[PDB]
Amino acid sequence: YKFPKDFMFGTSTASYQIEGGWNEDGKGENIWDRLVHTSPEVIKDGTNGDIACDSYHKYKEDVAIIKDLNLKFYRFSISWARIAPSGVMNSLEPKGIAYYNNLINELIKNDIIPLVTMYHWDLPQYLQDLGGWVNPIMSDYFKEYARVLFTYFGDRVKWWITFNEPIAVCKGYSIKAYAPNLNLKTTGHYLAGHTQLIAHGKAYRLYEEMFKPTQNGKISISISGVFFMPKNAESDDDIETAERANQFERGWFGHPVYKGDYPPIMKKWVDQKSKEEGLPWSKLPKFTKDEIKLLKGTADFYALNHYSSRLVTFGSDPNPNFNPDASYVTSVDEAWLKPNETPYIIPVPEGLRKLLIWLKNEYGNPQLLITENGYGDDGQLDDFEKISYLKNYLNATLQAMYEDKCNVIGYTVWSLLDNFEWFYGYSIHFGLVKIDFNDPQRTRTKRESYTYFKNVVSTGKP
Numbered sequence: 001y002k003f004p005k006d007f008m009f010g011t012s013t014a015s016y017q018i019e020g021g022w023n024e025d026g027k028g029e030n031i032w033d034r035l036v037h038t039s040p041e042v043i044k045d046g047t048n049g050d051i052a053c054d055s056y057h058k059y060k061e062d063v064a065i066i067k068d069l070n071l072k073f074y075r076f077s078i079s080w081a082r083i084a085p086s087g088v089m090n091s092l093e094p095k096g097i098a099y100y101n102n103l104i105n106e107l108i109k110n111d112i113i114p115l116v117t118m119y120h121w122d123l124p125q126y127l128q129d130l131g132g133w134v135n136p137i138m139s140d141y142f143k144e145y146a147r148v149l150f151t152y153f154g155d156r157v158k159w160w161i162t163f164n165e166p167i168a169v170c171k172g173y174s175i176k177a178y179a180p181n182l183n184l185k186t187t188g189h190y191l192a193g194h195t196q197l198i199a200h201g202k203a204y205r206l207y208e209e210m211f212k213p214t215q216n217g218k219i220s221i222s223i224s225g226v227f228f229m230p231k232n233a234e235s236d237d238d239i240e241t242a243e244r245a246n247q248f249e250r251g252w253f254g255h256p257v258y259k260g261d262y263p264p265i266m267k268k269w270v271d272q273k274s275k276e277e278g279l280p281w282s283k284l285p286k287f288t289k290d291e292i293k294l295l296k297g298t299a300d301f302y303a304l305n306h307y308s309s310r311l312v313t314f315g316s317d318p319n320p321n322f323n324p325d326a327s328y329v330t331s332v333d334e335a336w337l338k339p340n341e342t343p344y345i346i347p348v349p350e351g352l353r354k355l356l357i358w359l360k361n362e363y364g365n366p367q368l369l370i371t372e373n374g375y376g377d378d379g380q381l382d383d384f385e386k387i388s389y390l391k392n393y394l395n396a397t398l399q400a401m402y403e404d405k406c407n408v409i410g411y412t413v414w415s416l417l418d419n420f421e422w423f424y425g426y427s428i429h430f431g432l433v434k435i436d437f438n439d440p441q442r443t444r445t446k447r448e449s450y451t452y453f454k455n456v457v458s459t460g461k462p
Contacts, residue, residue: 142199269327
């Protein structure tokens with residue numbers, strides 16, 4: 001198989017992970033600045049995003065590399081606190097707006113489509129002091145932020161993602177996995193998810209009413225998660241468990257946006273767990289009729305981030321990344337493991353094929369853009385395991401397209417550049433391009449995977 005001529009290839013970064021310039025040009029403090037500066041020990045290699053790839057200054061070089069790759073689009077995120085230091089949009093910083101205008105204009109003059117992520121985890125700290133995403137008022141603050149983005153950039157930006165990986169944003173509140181590094185457990189988990197969903201819906205409907213008539217763009221939300229398969233493929237029990245685990249992982253966000261309301265299985269299980277805990281109301285908030293209508297239909301394409309998969313059966317998982325309200329325990333198929341240190345991302349290309357089918361069947365075969373896929377390693381230039389991962393996942397994508405008729409419209413490699421991998425710091429290297437983080441000039445060096453991907457983009461053949 002090969003990718004068709006009109007297939008969209010791209011690459012992605014995120015603001016905090018590459019930009020640096022963390023306190024330059026009036027930029028406000030965000031929750032990642034706060035975390036790395038006041039709890040530096042939380043980053044496993046003792047690093048921070050103060051400088052990162054210095055793409056705040058080096059963005060023209062980033063665009064030149066994208067142009068050399070001949071990519072159709074570049075997915076990047078906008079730092080809310082560069083635009084409005086407090087997160088409140090009555091005080092805008094023109095220098096922050098200018099940076100993103102400069103990047104957008106650089107992309108367009110090089111015939112690259114900008115695909116903009118509004119929120120990739122860098123909440124302004126003032127808004128976190130209100131409680132951030134577990135405070136329902138945050139959806140109105142997000143709506144106003146989106147308004148400003150559409151106003152300043154929407155004449156040129158026609159592809160938008162509201163939220164990157166809302167599940168990960170939730171985990172920053174619930175299980176100390178990301179900024180703001182709180183331990184609110186499942187109660188906080190669902191509060192953060194609910195607010196992000198309402199925020200998404202408000203932004204989409206605002207776009208529809210106030211900007212789409214003249215801008216004619218598209219919006220989605222990048223829904224991620226570990227994909228789950230039955231431990232025993234012949235067990236009805238395990239098949240049921242996998243469906244529940246999948247609905248809890250990604251149906252949580254997709255069901256409201258595509259089908260209306262939360263997944264029925266989440267209502268059942270969360271309401272019951274809440275009763276078992278003696279809580280006066282369910283941990284899963286209830287949408288109003290009007291909110292269900294607000295949210296249903298708020299994606300013009302399905303945006304998928306995907307990395308890996310696990311087997312499941314009924315039980316309890318010691319890893320807090322797996323939602324205990326769904327009562328599944330994960331495992332890794334022996335076939336996926338090798339006699340060495342386990343990679344950061346365990347390659348399970350069959351999982352992507354099966355996930356694409358799952359999404360096709362659950363949501364009526366929406367046009368689907370893979371907004372992130374990639375593999376992170378020790379940063380060697382001969383990154384052959386990364387090449388193999390990309391090749392195998394690209395082939396899984398082609399199988400889903402041509403064998404199972406999945407409406408996949410594009411694919412995005414995470415990432416163009418090595419970058420700050422959150423609590424792992426620079427220690428995990430996802431880049432097609434190596435960055436020397438010990439060099440003040442943050443020198444770029446192309447890896448073997450760069451040439452591999454360049455060739456796939458040109459020929460359509462993994």
